[PDB]
Design a protein around this ligand. Structure first.
Ligand SMILES: Nc1ncnc2c1ncn2[C@@H]1O[C@H](COP(=O)(O)OP(=O)(O)OP(=O)(O)O)[C@@H](O)[C@H]1O
Ligand SMILES: [Mg+2]
Lengths: 50, 469, 41
């Protein structure tokens, strides 16, 4: 589902895809945007974050 | 959003990144903004390549000076289009189709994309019909084809543009159809002069002018010909009009393509030209054609770099033409105007089946005499005619008179010499050159044959010089 | 479960938080220099 939604929003994926930006900032973005939500598995969250 | 952003800028070539699924199709027009005060403008970019990873390589139609990486790029969803219709006649346009003399004019006209396929092969009809010009050399040795393709090759300063103006004077003035002039990579002041002259001669109302000149990015120089060709194509197809398409200079289109190809990162071909030189030439040229029942008479000036007719550009241009007038620096140096190389120029309709037996025989005899004269140039350059036999001496005198007589006081040459031009009927030209080959003017001085019209002018000039005809 | 709206606010917040330019010469030779940075040049 996460891959599906990322593909649906190519702009978000491209923004997350810039390795130039700090890893921590993008990790926080994903946590507080998609990864961190009530209906998200913890293991999937951590895996995608790393 | 479905908009892109500039990622690389290298001269007039720009790489634009788009979100996946929004990558513009090849040849689509995109718009970007330059904000710096002096150079503020809206860049039109043409998609040229897909680079992968949603990147497109595009050619700018305006100088990219002041452009910044990251600026938004919008896709218009369509290729460059130019206004079409009878309204374009009498007005001056640029490659993008903006009206220069009346800015904002034509925005409401129908717009045609400047990219289209050539006519279907089954719609092509060979054209074999002589377009008489009144020029002795053209009429006799390289007759032009009505509805065919004519080219005027030449180095720098041999008289290509003057001959284009001469043919506008002779063919376009007494023309009932439409004329399209495409200035491609040529002097801007030449365009202004042509505009003023056409207005003066009341030919502008029947002419559409499209100018992309030297001081333009290569993209504009390689798309202005397509814009003018689109206007001509509309006149040919949508209105059933006879069309005169004047192009000056097509080699500039090829050279701009070469610069663009260098920018795009393609591997150079021979002499540094683009690998797709023949192909671009072919698409452009095969769009310029007369279909069945719809006539375009196109005349193109082709620059020859460094007087090198072996250069790939003119060499590939040669194959697309019905009539070819090759101007020569050697002929130009002798003061002969037009500086036509009779032994190098050719025409596909100079055969007995089309021009008759008399025209063909006279032309072939002239060519034979001139060829024999050229073969003797080695001996003559060292020793002169004195060592030649009597037959060779007679032929040399005849050939010198013939080469003088192929010159003519042109109509467009009045601005230079101050002498009015002359027109020579085809029958008179054939008869006069028949007499010259036979030897009925072997007694007049050579200068009597220089820059005159028919036989009446020859007699008058001989009388002025003290001879008699 | 997809928000479909928090995405825009989140990206806007991230770009806003992330937001004189000085470049650095990375290589130089024969009258040509290469300068990293200066994104607004
Ligand atoms: N018929 C002619 N009579 C007299 N002078 C002529 C004639 N044709 C050309 N010239 C002279 O040669 C010059 C070059 O003419 P023109 O500009 O037409 O040449 P061109 O081959 O188009 O040149 P370029 O490569 O610079 O564009 C003219 O300005 C004029 O000086
Ligand atoms: Mg010229």
């Amino acid at each position: 589902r996460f891959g599906r939604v990322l593909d649906a929003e190519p702009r978000l994926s491209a923004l997350l895809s810039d390795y130039t930006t700090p890893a921590e900032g993008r990790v926080a973005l994903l946590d507080k945007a998609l990864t961190g939500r009530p209906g998200v598995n913890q293991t999937a969250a951590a895996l995608l974050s790393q | 959003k479905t908009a892109g952003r500039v990622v690389r800028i290298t001269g007039p070539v720009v790489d634009v990144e788009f979100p996946r699924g929004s990558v513009p199709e090849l040849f689509n027009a995109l718009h970007a903004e330059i904000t710096f005060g002096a150079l503020a403008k809206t860049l039109t970019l043409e998609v040229a390549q897909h680079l992968g990873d949603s990147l497109v390589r595009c050619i700018s139609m305006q100088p990219t000076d002041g452009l910044v990486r990251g600026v938004e790029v919008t896709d218009t969803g369509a290729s460059i289009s130019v206004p079409v219709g009878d309204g374009v006649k009498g007005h001056v346009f640029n490659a993008l189709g903006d009206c220069l003399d009346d800015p904002g004019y034509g925005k409401d006209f129908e717009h045609w994309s400047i990219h289209r396929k050539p006519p279907a092969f089954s719609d092509l009809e060979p054209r074999t019909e002589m377009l008489e010009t009144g020029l002795k050399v053209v009429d006799l040795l390289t007759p032009y084809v009505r509805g065919g393709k004519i080219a005027l090759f030449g180095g720098a300063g041999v008289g290509k543009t003057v001959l284009i103006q001469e043919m506008i004077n002779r063919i376009a003035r007494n023309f009932g159809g439409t004329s399209v002039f495409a200035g491609v990579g040529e002097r801007t002041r030449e365009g202004n002069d042509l505009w003023v002259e056409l207005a003066d001669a009341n030919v502008l109302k029947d002419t559409a002018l499209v100018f992309g000149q030297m001081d333009e990015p290569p993209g504009t120089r390689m798309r202005v010909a397509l814009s003018a060709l689109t206007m001509a194509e509309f006149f040919r197809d949508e209105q059933g009009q006879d069309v005169l398409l004047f192009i000056d200079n097509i080699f500039r289109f090829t050279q701009a393509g070469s610069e663009v190809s260098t920018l795009l990162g393609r591997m150079p071909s021979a002499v540094g030209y683009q690998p797709t030189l023949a192909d671009e030439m072919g698409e452009l040229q095969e769009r310029i054609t007369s279909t069945r029942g719809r006539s375009i008479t196109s005349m193109q000036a082709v620059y020859v770099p460094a007087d090198d007719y072996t250069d790939p550009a003119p060499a590939t241009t040669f194959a697309h033409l019905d009539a070819t007038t090759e101007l020569s620096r050697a002929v130009f140096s002798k003061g002969i105007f037009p500086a036509v190389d009779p032994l190098a120029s050719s025409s596909t309709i100079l055969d007995p089946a089309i021009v008759g037996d008399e025209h063909y025989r006279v032309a072939q005899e002239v060519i034979r005499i001139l060829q024999r004269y050229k073969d003797l140039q080695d001996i003559i350059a060292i020793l002169g005619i004195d060592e030649l036999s009597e037959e060779d001496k007679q032929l040399v005198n005849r050939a010198r008179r013939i080469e003088r007589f192929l010159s003519q006081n042109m109509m467009a040459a009045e601005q230079f010499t101050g002498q009015p031009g002359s027109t020579v009927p085809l029958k008179e030209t054939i008869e006069a050159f028949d007499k010259l080959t036979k030897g009925e003017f072997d007694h007049l001085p050579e200068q009597a044959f220089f820059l005159i019209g028919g036989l009446d002018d020859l007699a008058k000039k001989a009388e002025s010089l003290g001879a008699k005809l | 479960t997809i928000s479909a709206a928090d995405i825009e606010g989140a990206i806007e917040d991230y770009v806003s938080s992330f937001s004189e330019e000085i470049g650095t010469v990375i290589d130089a030779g024969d009258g040509i220099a290469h300068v990293e940075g200066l994104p607004s040049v």
